[PDB]
Scaffold this active site. Structure first.
Site, short mmCIF file in Angstrom:
data_model
loop_
_atom_site.label_atom_id
_atom_site.label_comp_id
_atom_site.label_asym_id
_atom_site.label_seq_id
_atom_site.Cartn_x
_atom_site.Cartn_y
_atom_site.Cartn_z
N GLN A 16 0.63 -0.94 0.19
CA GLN A 16 0.24 0.08 0.41
C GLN A 16 0.92 1.16 -0.10
OE1 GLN A 16 -3.10 2.55 2.42
NE2 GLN A 16 -3.42 -0.08 2.58
N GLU A 139 1.31 -1.17 8.64
CA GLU A 139 0.53 0.17 8.87
C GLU A 139 0.71 0.14 10.66
OE1 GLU A 139 -1.43 1.78 7.24
OE2 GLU A 139 -1.85 2.87 9.66
N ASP A 168 0.59 3.87 6.08
CA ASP A 168 0.86 3.34 4.48
C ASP A 168 -0.03 4.73 3.77
OD1 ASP A 168 1.51 0.81 6.21
OD2 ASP A 168 -0.39 -0.22 5.29
N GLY A 247 -6.87 18.92 18.31
CA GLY A 247 -6.20 19.84 17.15
C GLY A 247 -7.25 21.07 17.21
N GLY A 248 -9.09 20.27 16.86
CA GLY A 248 -9.41 20.62 16.97
C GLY A 248 -10.69 21.35 18.14
#
Ligand SMILES: CC(=O)SCCNC(=O)CCNC(=O)[C@H](O)C(C)(C)COP(=O)(O)OP(=O)(O)OC[C@H]1O[C@@H](n2cnc3c(N)ncnc32)[C@H](O)[C@@H]1OP(=O)(O)O
Ligand SMILES: CC(=O)SCCNC(=O)CCNC(=O)[C@H](O)C(C)(C)COP(=O)(O)OP(=O)(O)OC[C@H]1O[C@@H](n2cnc3c(N)ncnc32)[C@H](O)[C@@H]1OP(=O)(O)O
Lengths: 415, 415
Positions: A16, A139, A168, A247-248
């Site tokens: 991937q 992953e 990935d 982060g918001g």
């Protein structure tokens, strides 16, 4: 015209991370030649097949628009073909295990002598400096090493991996940025260069805000916006915060009608600082607008889950879509938790070219995620993924090999 | 020389999505002029301050190497300065609420007339044809709308947000790819263009593998590698799978010594298909190598948690770092769940330039995530973030304004 018209890319990748990068290159107009082991090909062709005997969706969704050649680069002929390919190409991308391309004889140092204009992109699990430089990564190994698993999930549960491909496709997108910057740089220098991207670094880049938090924690001993403040405790490392804003702005995942039986009957709801008055009006709490226990983020924080519980008294009564249609009239940042089923069928995602129906030989229709960013001067044309070795003869002919040379390669298992 | 040497960027952004993109442009050598509201500046300057009265880390970790001008683009002078800036720039980036830049008079159509070579990058929560086109979005709103929250977490828990900035920095990286591609395209066309990136699409791109799974689920009615198979049940949408392998090989988050008191005393452990024999040797189960209940992924799946439980009998006895040092000798893909504390102090991450110590005026030292991809032909020089309006006079002088003109702008609150 297209951004990468005339660019030739050697895609020596699998799975991937590498293939996501080179698929975008193809969509941007590059000629991407996927170099595959004869008779086997990219492992994703055979992984989790839904239709017997044909390429799996893992493959077709990551290899649209590419050409496929079968080439055994461990044979004498194969090495010579690889060298000719390198001499003609602009970009070589690989994501095989640490040491793999080196051991074939194609170290960066050799690649450079063959073609000083070539840009060589390499993805690995970990950086050259790392104690884990030789470690194989998938992953979730990168999610663990890069900080994401540590900080995702609940404070009273284990580290949690994200469904999103942080290790990935994210790493593929980071390599892509480096390749495009290297093409721009080559316009000035006349030279290629090596661009390396590790999966650990890709995850870390997306966890920049948690490195911000770690520093705040080191300085202060607490994180004022985290669920643990002020009635819980902090240890020496950023903790998991459940469904907090990150982060918001402050927010949470709230139940909507159906949640008992439908795992996706939810919304994300943000309490935006500057929107407290409209938020209060939305939920019929005018009395909270100027109440000193409620009127600022700082005063709300110690009883914020009471506030969310109160909002949930409304949201459990309507469908998530209705909840959102109503709340956004109050300028509240919110959205339903959309399932992959809803996404796969969403007409607006078809219209924007974000979910794209493609017709694959033998299989027929499938869906893929399209080119995520939109350009006013060009539209990618997303096509089928190649059958294994479909383009071997054409590619060898383009390199100047005769029919006898190609027949000899086939006899010698070079192709 | 640097990749973007000589490129001029107008950074009309705030928070995380837009600023992450333009910070990378600065590191690649562009002159990035951050345009900020006078007396206020980017909201991150004052969000979650750890030191009173100076720029917060949220700001310094996203705005390294930029210049700052204070300019009120709603005034008559400010509009004219913005126009002159647009005429001289290569790129303009904005991420204000839907409609915001339009309403100032800087629609794409107008930007184009001022400078046909300019590339205009715009981030929004949702695409133009979305029913949510006008909706405000923060990080987790995009994670909900893009498929990530639906598929992250446990099957018997709620949707879960990722700590990683899937909606913010990820979107900035996607826009950056588009801007670099547009610079390459402009070499051919002689023209700029508009590049738009939505936060929902950025999340969806990283959830490509779950769209694969949704199609498998639609066709088959089951997902053979998910925890729910074959002894649980599937609904119509891809479910949450806890700590399962996802796009990688089958695996899980396993407890190591200390887990009852240390939320990060864990590793991720992968059972790589082709590595079953070495995996068995690692855990002292030679009898499982050819046992038909264990020797293939298909046979292991129905009792895979018994297998993880057996591995955990070993891992709980040693610290995570020792567990990994041992298991990697068997070519097992694994890594410790590293905390942000471990990451912040990791010598190898300093050496690779992945975590970088920067000296900021007033504050002194801070840490940031560096340029994630590594280039053999250049090394980014990561510097301090600008003080608010530090570069206002220089920028206006570069545009050709006299001292009287600048004085008039200050008097008229244009700067
Ligand atoms: C989808 C995601 O991408 S998931 C994570 C992907 N990982 C990365 O991108 C990080 C780097 N890659 C890796 O760590 C590894 O490739 C893994 C873990 C994904 C898989 O490793 P493995 O399956 O055990 O081996 P891998 O496919 O890399 O290479 C197997 C062999 O094929 C060889 N090979 C590859 N292409 C060819 C070819 N055309 N002809 C002959 N041999 C080839 C390799 O040289 C290697 O042989 P060697 O061990 O004798 O040197
Ligand atoms: C952590 C995170 O999750 S970050 C999320 C980032 N989001 C995005 O990138 C998607 C698009 N952005 C948005 O949806 C929004 O910007 C939000 C939700 C982040 C914040 O929205 P808001 O509450 O409107 O604040 P926003 O900063 O966008 O609007 C600022 C106002 O200042 C104005 N403004 C901005 N720069 C200037 C300037 N230099 N001079 C004068 N006015 C300015 C805008 O035009 C707007 O004014 P208006 O409402 O009269 O039109």
């Amino acid at each position: 015209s297209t951004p990468l018209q005339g660019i030739k890319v050697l895609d020596f990748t699998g799975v991937q991370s590498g293939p996501s990068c080179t698929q975008m290159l193809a969509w941007f107009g590059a000629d991407v030649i996927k170099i595959e082991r004869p008779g086997v090909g990219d492992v994703t062709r055979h992984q989790l097949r839904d239709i017997p005997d044909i390429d799996a969706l893992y493959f077709t969704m990551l290899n649209s628009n590419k050409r496929s050649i079968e080439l055994n680069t461990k044979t004498a002929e194969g090495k010579e073909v690889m060298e000719k390919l390198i001499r003609e190409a602009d970009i070589l991308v690989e994501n095989f295990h640490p040491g793999a391309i080196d051991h074939m004889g194609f170290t960066w140092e050799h690649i450079q002598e063959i073609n000083p204009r070539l840009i060589f992109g390499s993805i690995k699990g970990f950086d050259e400096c790392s104690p884990y430089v030789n470690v194989k990564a998938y992953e979730n190994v990168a999610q663990a090493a890069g900080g994401a698993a540590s900080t995702t999930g609940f404070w009273d549960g284990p580290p949690l991996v994200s469904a999103a491909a942080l290790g990935d496709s994210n790493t593929g997108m980071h390599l892509l940025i480096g390749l495009l910057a290297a093409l721009l740089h080559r316009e000035k220098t006349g030279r290629g260069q090596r661009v390396t991207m590790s999966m650990q670094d890709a995850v870390l880049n997306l966890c920049r805000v948690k490195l911000r938090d770690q520093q705040r924690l080191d300085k202060l001993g607490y994180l004022e916006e985290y669920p643990q403040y002020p009635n819980g405790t902090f240890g020496d490392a950023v903790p998991r915060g459940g469904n907090a804003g990150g982060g918001g702005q402050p927010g949470w995942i709230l139940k909507c009608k159906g949640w008992e039986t439908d795992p996706n009957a939810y919304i994300y709801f943000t309490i935006q600082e500057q929107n407290w008055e409209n938020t209060c009006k939305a939920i019929g709490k005018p009395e909270w607008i100027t109440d000193p226990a409620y009127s600022t983020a700082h005063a709300r924080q110690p009883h914020i889950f009471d506030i969310f519980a109160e909002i949930e008294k409304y949201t459990v009564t309507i469908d998530k879509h209705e909840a959102v249609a109503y709340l956004t009239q109050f300028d509240i940042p919110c959205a339903p938790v959309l399932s992959m089923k809803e996404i796969s069928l969403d007409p607006s995602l078809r219209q924007s070219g974000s979910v794209v129906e493609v017709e694959q030989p033998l299989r027929g229709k499938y869906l893929t995620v399209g080119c995520p960013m939109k350009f006013s001067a060009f539209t990618p044309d997303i096509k089928a993924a190649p059958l294994l070795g479909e383009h071997t003869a054409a590619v060898l002919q383009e390199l100047g090999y005769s029919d006898d040379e190609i027949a000899a390669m086939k006899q010698n298992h070079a192709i």
